[PDB]
Ligand SMILES: N#Cc1ccc2c(Oc3ccccc3OCCn3ccc(=O)[nH]c3=O)cccc2c1
């Protein structure tokens with residue numbers, strides 16, 4: 001079976017072929033391996049070879065509990081073989097598929113064995129079936145199963161094979177995934193079956209068999225963790241385990257399944273569980289479950305109680321994205337064309353820092369959605385967002401970092417994204433000026449936070465088990481606690497200055513959160529910085 | 543052209559493997575058209591699975607026609623074999639010309655061609671991408687101007703003979719032509735060079751003024767009435783500049799604030815403090831001592847957003863030593879955004895850097911990674927691409943370089 005051209009293959013430079021010996025396993029499977037190898041010899045898939053290849057790869061035979069399968073271990077050869085263009089990893093997302101009147105699934109059997117292997121490379125595929133006294137030598141003429149080059153070379157071969165058929169049939173759309181072909185068309189059912197038959201025979205001319213019966217797979221289709229119905233898609237049912245104790249492995253699989261659920265079931269929250277997964281220690285140990293994680297999990301269970309589906313994609317209809325706040329640090333989004341019919345859903349939980357605010361997270365969510373949309377639909381969607389032009393404009397104008405804000409429309413669906421507070425850009429007249437400082441002995445971890453004001457008020461609060469940074473935040477917090485609704489605060493800490501000027505409404509540290517509550521309760525707050533250890537109102541202490 | 547220049551990679555190093563970035567349907571369409579035509583013209587050829595290598599490609603508008611830009615940064619890093627005039631920056635006018643098309647006249651070393659492999663991506667992973675490699679010298683590859691160098695010398699020789707005072711420097715796909723001539727004369731000579739290039743079969747389908755380029759002097763505020771907050775800002779800024787300029791003193795200025803005063807309190811400048819401030823204004827006029835360019839070290843460009851369409855930048859090698867500083871501005875017209883201005887600024891800084899040192903700086907970009915990676919090709923008109931990374935550095939930086 002020459003007509004398929006062979007891809008040239010080389011070993012890695014400086015490397016020879018595998019000499020690894022056959023491991024007996026003198027068990028009766030020998031004869032099995034004979035029978036199979038005779039059949040494959042009849043079909044020209046393999047060949048007996050002269051006494052000097054010289055090379056070897058281990059061959060095995062088994063039946064998992066009637067048939068017998070030959071399994072060759074190509075690991076050593078695979079390490080010694082050149083890389084090939086990476087075979088398809090990413091799969092088409094169901095939400096990106098365009099609805100077709102008829103869809104057929106074609107599994108080609110013995111896919112790899114139907115494609116010839118490069119002649120000069122065949123000697124390296126040699127294997128031995130053991131004689132009882134000590135054997136018969138064989139080599140592959142086709143792409144072996146388990147070999148490094150098989151998927152990419154078969155992929156290429158299949159593409160080239162498919163070109164002439166697709167050329168004369170532009171109205172039918174063919175997806176190629178591994179061995180499978182998925183063939184859609186809008187043609188009448190009869191002539192669709194006809195076109196399928198044509199494709200089948202065309203493939204048969206290249207030595208590729210397709211399902212002979214009325215094709216083995218019927219709607220719906222279980223494919224890569226999905227259910228594909230003619231009019232809709234969804235995910236295969238997600239079963240969340242119930243345990244008293246959880247290891248880090250269990251939590252990884254849990255957040256995995258939940259992540260998988262998030263693309264369709266709206267409202268999924270993974271954050272607190274991955275917070276549990278912040279421990280990287282090798283995956284054995286029992287990880288303590290936090291109340292927040294338990295709550296999160298329970299809510300997820302309540303969401304997964306109801307059945308949910310997505311729809312398929314129409315290029316003529318607009319692409320629309322909508323975003324809602326899920327509570328602390330967490331967001332959820334829906335992508336749809338028809339208003340209540342979701343193409344898909346998702347989430348954004350990421351802080352990407354110890355502190356952030358709502359608008360920043362929203363903008364990041366928009367970014368993630370944009371990327372995903374480009375990947376799946378090859379275009380960016382329209383955004384319906386729960387934020388007002390004034391809010392966002394003020395934010396991105398006063399934001400030091402460059403940002404891209406799309407065309408969007410304000411939808412009013414509380415909670416609305418808002419600025420909980422805004423620091424003053426100018427010092428406040430009539431407001432008390434707090435000169436703050438804090439310090440800690442790095443050895444003893446003991447510290448203090450204090451202020452002196454222009455009204456003549458001075459205070460010092462003692463602190464235990466703390467650092468200079470935390471004390472410098474502590475001082476600011478202290479000045480917030482003891483002042484009126486309007487306050488001027490002066491600090492020598494670049495750290496604290498950086499944290500507050502960023503205007504976070506949420507944080508990992510409870511100290512910063514307290515500071516945020518204070519800032520919200522305030523009306524006017526101005527933060528100013530001065531260089532430390534120069535003549536200044538606030539002075540210094542130890 | 544039949545004789546190919548053999549090209550090698552630095553010992554113990556393989557070809558580039560780099561992820562192709564997802565693209566919109568439009569850009570993919572454009573790339574498919576372009577690559578179809580290029581394949582018909584023999585410039586590129588389809589390749590099989592036996593080629594592991596990949597290089598990113600993008601579609602940019604540079605006219606209405608789509609252009610294909612290949613990002614060769616990795617291949618450029620991994621492949622080197624083999625001058626910059628110092629007078630180019632002194633010239634009154636410098637014009638840039640795209641000579642890249644010429645590279646398509648020269649075939650590429652066969653054994654090396656596989657390292658030029660690139661992929662036109664598919665939407666939603668419907669198909670594996672369309673894979674090509676280059677049969678000729680690709681634009682953006684640093685081997686191209688090196689191999690074409692003798693031809694370029696041959697073509698330019700008569701012109702240089704005719705115009706001895708005109709400077710011509712080549713970087714990548716670009717010719718930089720400086721002159722001290724009057725603008726009209728300059729553009730006339732430029733056009734002469736253009737037609738000279740065209741009639742010899744070199745296709746050339748942006749003028750600077752490096753004479754005006756300078757390192758920004760630090761500017762101190764001028765006020766009729768000074769508050770405590772103002773003098774605090776002043777002292778902080780002068781303290782920052784004190785590292786760079788040794789003579790600066792804050793004592794008399796800080797004396798006015800000496801303790802426990804309200805921020806909004808108006809503080810008059812005493813003649814001593816005003817003396818100190820004036821002296822500091824005077825020392826800020828002179829350039830910094832001991833700042834020299836090192837060709838063996840990476841150039842580094844930091845940018846910060848000043849708002850209202852203003853952006854400031856610094857080019858340095860080692861911290862606090864500034865080879866150049868500048869400020870870029872754009873008239874908004876309500877069309878503009880942050881990404882556009884940042885991209886433009888990056889291109890301008892890179893051009894300035896090429897003109898002055900003959901190399902591109904490593905950029906520290908005040909933007910989110912994914913946002914830049916998404917939108918940067920929209921406004922990018924340049925044939926080359928700089929290295930870049932992404933940082934914030936807000937806290938004291940905006941106010942000081944403002
Ligand atoms: N197993 C399996 C399997 C089956 C079909 C796939 C596929 O099916 C398609 C193949 C070609 C063209 C359109 C396709 O689907 C569009 C959406 N759709 C999907 C399923 C259905 O019944 N009807 C329908 O209109 C597209 C992509 C992957 C597929 C995997």
Ligand SMILES: [Mg+2]
Nearest residue numbers: 107178179180
């Ligand atoms: Mg299959």
Ligand SMILES: [Mg+2]
Nearest residue numbers: 437492493532
């Ligand atoms: Mg301090």
